[PDB]
Design a protein around this ligand. Structure first.
Ligand SMILES: OC[C@H]1O[C@@H](O)[C@H](O)[C@@H](O)[C@@H]1O
Ligand SMILES: [Ca+2]
Length: 771
């Protein structure tokens, strides 16, 4: 490996060998079908609301999130980078697809597949990833840096459906070498969203943009139809000329054939036929190819950028609603703009690299923080783009001043912005894209007094319940299978209208968003104040025994939606205390004296009673009435966690908080697989895992990172990092379970999982709240 020193890979990048087999991978631990796309994954490409494309460490374009809200894992084998190399004065050269694999069927059988093992590495530090190619049969070594412009406090480039591939080639040998790099892409119009005739009308064209001292050559892969539908638009790939390189292209090769129409040209001398051909296809799949060729002298390096764009302006949801995607604000809505997007990237990618370096640098340059932590912190952010993210710029047909946003909980449970989960998972948004975060919270504020009296069947018990009760915060803002933002509470396993955490979590999220954006946004507090008061007043009515605290009802009436709580719970009860303290503080800011007085009085009574009912001398009991009420819950003081972040002070005595966190570390972490897998949710006082429910005996990745945050700002530094380390290790390490770029909700002690690609572990960013 002589190429690594010509490029700049941070030491904290996650790494794996190209073609590496992983032996220890986890699988779903549930009874019902659940997504398992394997460990062959990589950092995604694409902006927020754009649809994303997962290119794996083996090089394939395989995890397709272009249909917003859907996860489709299938390798489109035509989509590749390939290399030709010939030592000057040899008879023949060699050509190789840079993919550690081959197709299932006979299509593209002419190409040289099966990039060999031990011949390159993949590196990822989201939003950047890299591949190096150090192959004994390729005298020139190559690397590529690939990324999309995901940039905090930037709501423009961050939305773009674009990826840059910046190649570096270096000749360490004593001979001249002829080198070509070729990007191939299938015209994927009709890959999703088209019910019949999936290739029909697809056509490819070549654009040559020759301005002064500059040239871009691109293929635009579209359809002759001007229908404004989810399936229609354009893909583009292309390259920018640099000194020393020539460009060649082929507009049309057949992807549903043996591929020799393209490959006979490239394998001969690395130079394509430059044949334009706009003939539309009928049944056959087609694609385009863009190549560069250059000669490298001994010791010489060259850099060449390629790019990929996709203008698919319309997202459709299963209930029928069609929306424009966010990026259409900047490029237009007609679906004929892929070249413009591509050109913008090719002309500005160096600036974008610098902007990415500027935001990563403060963390990367802090030498008190271990590299493993940095690996997890940046790489967990894959989910903001990859989580079915929807960001609308208008309903198709009919303009407001805001752009509605939603991130899925996950794909298995296809719910937008699940509030009991976003309590943990929305940290990166408040800290890095706060205008989005406030928009999401205003969305929730608007739903609080919605009433929907129609009934649904509750999954856990078969009872019928009202869909949405006035004054109760909803569980979620709909499903991609139905009507995001319009039909809320898509979730039905439990009835969220009787949850005891949603209303308190809502208030805490509101006050968080004010505090962590500098305590200046009074207008945001004003917008949400009526909803905050309503939320707390409604929850207070669920106090059945007059101790001033809502009563859990002996069912799973909160985020641990199979783990029953009864009476006063540490979890919901601490959240209630913190929510009351937040509302007091908002009361003061807004000069609502009577609210301050009321919530202050509620707080004093509740706080006194919480302490009396649950403090046992070492920790706070799980609750006052359950069968294992004295279990040690990892999340028992979630309210105090948030109160620390919100600078609300002590809701409980410092000494007791400290004792409880020490107990959690000593038990839930260190007595669960030697502290190498995170914090188990429930432990019995004798040091054995609580087995009363599957949730009690799992580690929740987001709970655990949040607990690490809580420990850290209570000065338990070693405990904090050791607790977080088990999550990092299981996710990313060779001794883990192979969950990189699909961090799950939960795993049991065997390492097997529930719900890959989950929002909750974005809570790692709560470990950085001074950002
Ligand atoms: O894993 C537990 C989670 O399951 C999801 O299906 C629910 O939508 C969440 O509210 C819950 O917290
Ligand atoms: Ca009560």
């Amino acid at each position: 490996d002589k190429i690594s020193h010509k490029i700049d890979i941070p030491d904290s990048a996650w790494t794996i060998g190209i073609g590496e087999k992983f032996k220890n991978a986890g699988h779903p631990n549930v009874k019902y079908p659940m997504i398992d796309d394997s460990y062959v994954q990589g950092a995604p490409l694409g902006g927020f609301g754009a649809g994303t494309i997962g290119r794996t460490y083996n090089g394939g374009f395989s995890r397709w999130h272009l249909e917003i809200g859907k996860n489709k894992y299938t390798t489109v084998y035509a989509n590749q980078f390939s290399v030709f190399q010939k030592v000057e004065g040899n008879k023949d050269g060699v050509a190789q697809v840079l993919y550690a694999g081959e197709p299932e069927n006979g299509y593209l059988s002419s190409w040289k597949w099966d990039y060999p093992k031990e011949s390159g590495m993949y590196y990822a530090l989201y939003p950047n990833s890299w591949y190096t190619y150090t192959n004994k049969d390729l005298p020139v070594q190559l690397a590529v840096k690939q990324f999309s412009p995901i940039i905090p406090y930037n709501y423009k480039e961050t939305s773009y459906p674009v990826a840059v591939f910046k190649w570096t080639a270096y000749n360490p040998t004593n001979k001249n070498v002829d080198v070509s790099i070729m990007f191939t892409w299938q015209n994927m119009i009709g890959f999703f969203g088209k019910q019949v005739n999936v290739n029909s009308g697809n056509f490819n064209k070549i654009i040559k943009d020759k301005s002064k001292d500059s040239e871009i050559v691109a293929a635009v892969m579209g359809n002759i139809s001007n229908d404004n539908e989810e399936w229609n638009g354009e893909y583009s790939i292309g390259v920018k000329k640099v000194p020393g390189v020539d460009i060649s292209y082929k507009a049309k090769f057949v992807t549903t054939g043996d591929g020799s129409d393209l490959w006979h040209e490239f394998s001969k001398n690395g130079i394509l036929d430059n044949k334009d051909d706009e003939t539309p296809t009928k049944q056959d799949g087609i694609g385009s190819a863009i190549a560069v060729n250059f000669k490298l002298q001994p010791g010489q390096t060259i850099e060449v950028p390629f790019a990929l764009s996709w203008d698919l302006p319309i997202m459709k949801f299963g209930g029928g609603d069609k929306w424009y995607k966010m990026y259409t604000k900047y490029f237009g809505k007609n679906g004929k703009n892929s070249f413009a997007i591509l050109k913008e990237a090719l002309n500005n990618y160096q600036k974008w690299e610098k902007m990415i370096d500027d935001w990563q640098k403060p963390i990367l340059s802090n030498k008190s923080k271990p590299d493993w932590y940095k690996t997890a912190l940046f790489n967990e952010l894959y989910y903001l783009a990859d989580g079915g993210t929807a960001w609308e710029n208008g309903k198709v047909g009919e303009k407001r001043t805001n752009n509605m946003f939603g991130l899925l909980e996950c794909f298995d449970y296809n719910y937008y912005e699940t509030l009991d989960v976003r309590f943990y998972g929305s940290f990166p948004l408040v800290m890095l894209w706060p205008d989005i975060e406030k928009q999401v919270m205003r969305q929730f504020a608007d739903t609080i007094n919605v009433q929907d009296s129609s009934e649904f069947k509750v999954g856990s018990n078969g009872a019928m319940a009202v869909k949405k009760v006035q004054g109760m915060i909803p569980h979620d803002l709909g499903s991609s299978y139905a009507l995001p933002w319009i039909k809320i509470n898509a979730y039905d396993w439990q009835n969220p209208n009787i949850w005891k955490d949603l209303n308190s979590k809502y208030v805490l999220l509101v006050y968080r968003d004010y505090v962590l954006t500098g305590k200046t946004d009074k207008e945001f507090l004003k917008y949400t104040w009526k909803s905050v008061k309503t939320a707390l007043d409604k929850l207070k009515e669920m106090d059945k025994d007059n101790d001033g605290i809502p009563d859990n009802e002996g069912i799973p009436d909160q985020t641990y939606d199979t783990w029953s709580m009864k009476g006063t719970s540490a979890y919901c009860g601490s959240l209630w205390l913190a929510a009351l303290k937040a509302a007091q503080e908002i009361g003061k800011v807004l000069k609502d004296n009577e609210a301050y007085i009321k919530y202050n009085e509620w707080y004093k009574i509740a706080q006194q009673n919480f302490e009396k009912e649950l403090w046992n001398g070492e920790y706070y009991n799980f609750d006052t009435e359950s069968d294992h009420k004295d279990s040690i819950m990892a999340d028992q003081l979630a309210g105090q966690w948030y109160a620390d972040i919100l600078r609300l002070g002590d809701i409980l005595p410092k000494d007791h908080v400290q004792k409880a966190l020490k107990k959690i570390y000593e038990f839930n972490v260190m007595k669960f697989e030697n502290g190498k897998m995170g914090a188990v949710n429930g432990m019995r006082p004798d040091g054995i895992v609580d087995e009363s429910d599957i949730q009690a005996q799992a580690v929740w990745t987001g709970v655990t990172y949040a607990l690490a945050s809580f420990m850290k700002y209570r000065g338990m530094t070693e405990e904090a990092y050791n607790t977080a380390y088990g999550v990092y290790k299981m996710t990313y390490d060779k001794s883990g379970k192979g969950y990189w770029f699909r961090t799950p909700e939960a795993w049991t002690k065997d390492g097997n999982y529930r719900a890959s690609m989950y929002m909750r572990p974005l809570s790692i960013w709560s470990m950085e709240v001074n950002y």
